[PDB]
Nucleic acid binder design. Structure first.
Ligand SMILES: Nc1ncnc2c1ncn2[C@@H]1O[C@H](COP(=O)(O)OP(=O)(O)O)[C@@H](O)[C@H]1O
Ligand SMILES: Nc1ncnc2c1ncn2[C@@H]1O[C@H](COP(=O)(O)OP(=O)(O)O)[C@@H](O)[C@H]1O
Ligand SMILES: Nc1ncnc2c1ncn2[C@@H]1O[C@H](COP(=O)(O)OP(=O)(O)O)[C@@H](O)[C@H]1O
Ligand SMILES: Nc1ncnc2c1ncn2[C@@H]1O[C@H](COP(=O)(O)OP(=O)(O)O)[C@@H](O)[C@H]1O
Ligand SMILES: Nc1ncnc2c1ncn2[C@@H]1O[C@H](COP(=O)(O)OP(=O)(O)O)[C@@H](O)[C@H]1O
Ligand SMILES: Nc1ncnc2c1ncn2[C@@H]1O[C@H](COP(=O)(O)OP(=O)(O)O)[C@@H](O)[C@H]1O
Ligand SMILES: [Cl-]
Ligand SMILES: [Cl-]
Ligand SMILES: [Mg+2]
Ligand SMILES: [Mg+2]
Ligand SMILES: [Mg+2]
Ligand SMILES: [Mg+2]
Ligand SMILES: [Mg+2]
Lengths: 270, 270, 270, 270, 270, 274
DNA sequence: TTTTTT
């Protein structure tokens, strides 16, 4: 009875960060009890179209709204997202544990986040069960980055994510993987623009984001990976951890990284 | 003369849990004898468009409603749906026949419904005709879960059901299938959110529901499937059901499952 | 006035069981001579949209209506459709000719119509020209079943039929085909619920219907379809159909099957 | 009045049997000089939509207007289309030249036209330049049949024609081609009902029409086409057909086939 | 009012032979300065739809208009397009230079343009730098034919062009190219009607146009191209070109071919 | 009520989007709704019950114009327009110094570049070959960036689509060609090298008969030396970069910017026959 | 959805 206003619903949707049709529809129809517009919505002979468009719009921003930030801004935004309690000390504990000086990682982490040529790829090498996927997965999750599945490597579309995320991580690189790297991904390592295909869409011309790599292989040593030497910052995690006792081993959480970034914000040149 | 009110149809559709076009259309056109709106519906020049949208809208509400519950609230609702007479005894019987203590299955079932990391995968391995498919099938049917079709698993779009159903089932996993699981779905097993891709402009990092699996392969034994050992609870049916000449044997039904949960509600920690 | 009434055309269409655009369009334009509405139709600036939607709408009902019945009820209805004169003896005669005790094909057919898991697939194996397609096709025609066309298996829309018909038939399965079946469709041959993809519509999890396959291959012998053994029932066809005789001594018809079901109704547990 | 009447255009298009957009649009725009409606057409802000729909509407008739007929009726209709002057002698001459009895061809053609199982495929094998395509194309032309380009087999939409025409022709089948046939098209070659996939529309179940195939390969001889034997028939044009004189000695026309059918109408059981 | 007139834009578009959206859109918006309609177009809330439909409309005319001529008529019209000054001697000289009697070329050309089965394909073979692509391209360019890129043959849509032009050219055919031809395109080299798929649109059955091919391989010599012998007319361009100082001693242009045809119209049986 | 003046005007949006060179829906949408604070039309836009469709079409429209504008220009005009774009301060001397460092007479490079830009047959491809770390990609990328060229990624040659860009840019660059790549060139792209038309196939759209633009290639392989690349010899101008641009620690000798090229073209416009 | 992508 009060002519439905799309823009309003979008706003609404956008405010509650509701981005999937299914929800928008439902949640709104609920607010129909105490909301003239919502009520107006259910009156529409085209709820369908709106719910769709509503979402389309919402995500539209959200994506765009994020693509906007700068690494700092972005990392700042990724902090508001971190919920719960923890402390940078946890991270420090671990690195110390691996016999690595946090400053070393910090210094490494500074040029990384900045995507500085030849300082754009961090590798965590070591025997199995040393915390490699741990850390790297926890950091990526924090940063809201994408994990690359080198299994799909057969398809050149296994890099499609690189056109979106701020940070990608290739977990457990094998010789076949490193070879791939040394062969086709050199630019992704020299900060030169690189082409990246997208399912059904046109290729994108972008700068390859920060890369995280875990491997049992010390590329730094193997001679067939020469080009990679100067292009991969390597930390060697040797001391094990996951022991035969069932006990919950270390686990850096979003919170932890929150503290880390918040407390090191000065030193990281952010 | 009265105008066709879409919203009404949707409500109707929603009240009868009529989610598929084919039906909605037919069933409504039937209530056209004693329903002004339906009669208004058949009067429309866009019946098609409506039926379509009607369905779209309904599934919307359903999906949103389905994901809203809590495993318990959900299960509880799945019981109300269970019509007919049966008894938990049928199930106990069979597990016994299969030489397994119900308590074992109950415990495993507990953590499963709770989707606890590493216990989120139930497997029923055994030689042909030992009753794996129905058990699984019957359980999934009761739970209102979806059946994944491995036949389309490339590009993983054989995981889009994963963003909706409270429990899926992989009936008859082949080496090729388990390989796939050991390769891409490790997360659906540890608890870490799985990147459930999908068709239109948006993908969702959803949490994988409990999984059910039937197979002739005993992943626990094979060594190439090491990762899956600690992440797949294996129950094995070695006794044959084959027996079928004359007396029409076993078939677990929604009712049977109703009794099962009702009477084991306490123990299941629901 | 002469405002075109869509709902009318549909009814029309529906009455004559006209479900394909091509026809509906043509046939109607014909009724334009003695029908105000069809004449109105040809007056529409959007006949296209109407023929399309009309059809869509018609199939909509039809499905709903067919999916509604029971197998006997369906079969029963498939009998009303069978016109002409023939007899069950023709069927008997042929099976005898192939040296197969009718009771054997009846007992098999009983559980086949019932779709009991794993007794849902019948294979008619034998050297070329033994009446296999001949038979299968007839029985499928009578049931108004659909043919899957493996040449399209490359498209996940090939099984669409499976979400509509009460019985499907794979005529002349090669090795490639049996391979595929053993590899993906075990949940189908079994006759359990499977997810079917359809163009324009949404996924559909319906119980895979009864299957009929004809082949030069004895999947029961080959150790490579090892796992198709507990699923495919077989009927060997050794004796030749035609052999220097104007017209095939055997050629079963709807009528013949009509007799068959009519006279064998009680034995088939219908 | 000066309103653009769609129905009119359709009639027009239909009368001239103009079924492809390209033409419809062009040919009409020409008649715009002396036709109020066409002129009205060019005035529309949605010519596009019309040309498209207009075509859609025309081929709709044409298809039904065909599938409705009967081979006798259809061939009959194909003769009225045959213009010019020729004589069945020309065809006879050729077949004699190739050293074959006209009663043999006819005997085959009779069954062929009737689309009888496994007697639905005629292959004209022989060395290059023996007039095979020459003959086969001319017949298909007369019959208004469609051709299948194997270069498109990669797409399941290559057989889309089969759901329309009364006769298909595979000109110059290579090994790859026969292999495909022996593997996926036994149904079709068998003139049995195969499901044909079409773009945007759903799969159509129809009886595979009669097939013509020219080939340097005698499937009858080769042993790997063992199963093609009982489905293919075969003719052998062993005698060279093109001469030194620019204009080749044999070149049949519609007229030629007209006579052929008209005079042989009785023997062909039409 | 002066509401945007679609037909006008189309006319404009057509007159300038602007057929791709990208241009039409841009070029029109430019004429917006001195064009009431263009200005009205920019005022449309649906320019998108219009640019598209305009293109669609234009192409239709463009194609329809070309498939509409007779080889003579077409060639005739292609002459009017030929601007500048040149002469057949210039074409001649070259052929003589290559040690080839013009009449030899003319005789083949006559039948080629007529598209007579199996004489529908010319091939210019020879060592690199002998003016093959030179000639062919110039001739295609005057005829206004399209060029096919074997770099795309992995998608049958690389032949889409065939369904439009009156003359196609495969420049620099390699072994893999000839093989593809010997395997799939026998029909096409033969100039018989064939099926041509088109992205999203529907397939068009049409007579393969005249082919021009340049290659370092002499198909008539190789024996694995046995069957391309009766289809491919060969030419031996051996004499190198650009000798000393880069300066191209040969430059064939539209004008040149204009003369060629104009003067040789009689002999070419046009 | 009657007479609306604030009414949402699509064309306006497009112009806006066009001006800022915003071509992707995601952005347009966001960036516009932001300008909604101080923009009657933007505000009108948000008032629309069909923002979706507009964002889409806006975009659709922007590229139409954008793609067309480029293809539109002449090599001169294009390069001219590429200059206005170049911001910052640099100098052609930076480029001279580098080539000099590489022991190559700038005139040599200039003489070739003059013909490259013209896209003249058999001189339509430049290759910068030499041991690793000699500033090849360095130079080539910079030049491509200024020109607004597109980079091809042989890591996708698998699908014939890896060349879709060739239907748009006025210059493409294949960085670090392996043997496999060169073979691919010698095999298929022989027309791209002779100026004769080739059919670029886009995704979901009909192919396009286009004239392959100028090509830039950097590689460790001297196609000029190898014998399995005979055809290429006369179709690939080669520059050998022997000297190591290598910069020990933080302090890069050679860096080349849009500015640097700006000066370069501005000051050499004459000699480049532009 | 078909074309892509597989
Ligand atoms: N998927 C995961 N979930 C939770 N923790 C993980 C996961 N992957 C790795 N970790 C953590 O990282 C450590 C294991 O690193 P690891 O996986 O052994 O490197 P690698 O795989 O090369 O042997 C463990 O201490 C564990 O806490
Ligand atoms: N719905 C049912 N009705 C009657 N019998 C059934 C039903 N489902 C399964 N069965 C019986 O159980 C057997 C199938 O057991 P099955 O599910 O194939 O075990 P598995 O999956 O390990 O191969 C069949 O032989 C069948 O007789
Ligand atoms: N509808 C029919 N009309 C006339 N003859 C038929 C018909 N169906 C089959 N036949 C005869 O039977 C033979 C085909 O048997 P077939 O179906 O191919 O056995 P199978 O399927 O095991 O290969 C043909 O030679 C044909 O003469
Ligand atoms: N429409 C036609 N007009 C004139 N001559 C034709 C025509 N069709 C075929 N020919 C002649 O017939 C010969 C081709 O016979 P052919 O088709 O190659 O038999 P096959 O297909 O078995 O190899 C050609 O040399 C050509 O001159
Ligand atoms: N349209 C033209 N104008 C001027 N010269 C041309 C033209 N076309 C070709 N040429 C000359 O011919 C030579 C190329 O011959 P070429 O195309 O390499 O034969 P092919 O294509 O078989 O390798 C070039 O050196 C060029 O100077
Ligand atoms: N635009 C630039 N700004 C500053 N330094 C650069 C720039 N481009 C390249 N370099 C320096 O040159 C090195 C890269 O040389 P490189 O491009 O790999 O030569 P090539 O392309 O032959 O392999 C880097 O270490 C970097 O310090
Ligand atoms: Cl099993
Ligand atoms: Cl058979
Ligand atoms: Mg089973
Ligand atoms: Mg058969
Ligand atoms: Mg032939
Ligand atoms: Mg050439
Ligand atoms: Mg480099």
């Amino acid at each position: 009875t009060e002519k439905f206003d799309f823009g309003t619903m979008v706003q609404w949707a956008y405010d509650h960060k509701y981005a999937e049709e299914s929800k928008i529809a439902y949640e709104y129809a609920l607010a129909a009890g105490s909301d003239s517009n919502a009520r107006a919505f259910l009156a529409t002979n085209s709820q369908a179209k709106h719910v769709k468009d509503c979402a389309t719009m919402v995500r539209h921003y959200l994506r765009a709204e994020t693509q906007a930030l700068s690494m700092p801004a972005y990392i700042k935004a990724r902090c508001k997202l971190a919920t719960g309690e923890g402390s940078w000390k946890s991270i420090l504990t671990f690195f110390n544990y691996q016999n690595i000086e946090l400053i070393t990682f910090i210094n490494a982490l500074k040029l990384w986040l900045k995507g500085i040529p030849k300082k754009n790829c961090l590798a965590f090498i070591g025997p199995p069960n040393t915390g490699k996927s741990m850390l790297c997965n926890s950091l990526i999750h924090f940063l809201g980055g994408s994990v690359l599945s080198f299994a799909n490597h057969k398809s050149h579309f296994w890099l499609a994510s690189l056109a979106d995320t701020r940070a990608a991580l290739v977990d457990d690189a094998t010789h076949a993987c490193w070879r791939y790297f040394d062969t086709y991904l050199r630019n992704a390592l020299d900060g030169y623009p690189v082409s990246i295909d997208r399912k059904h869409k046109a290729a994108v011309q972008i700068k390859a984001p920060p890369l995280l790599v875990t491997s049992n292989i010390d590329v730094q040593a193997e001679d067939r990976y020469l080009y990679l030497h100067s292009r991969v910052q390597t930390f060697r995690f040797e001391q094990p951890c996951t022991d035969e006792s069932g006990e919950q081993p270390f686990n850096i959480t979003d919170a932890d990284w929150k503290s880390f970034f918040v407390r090191l914000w000065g030193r990281l040149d952010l």
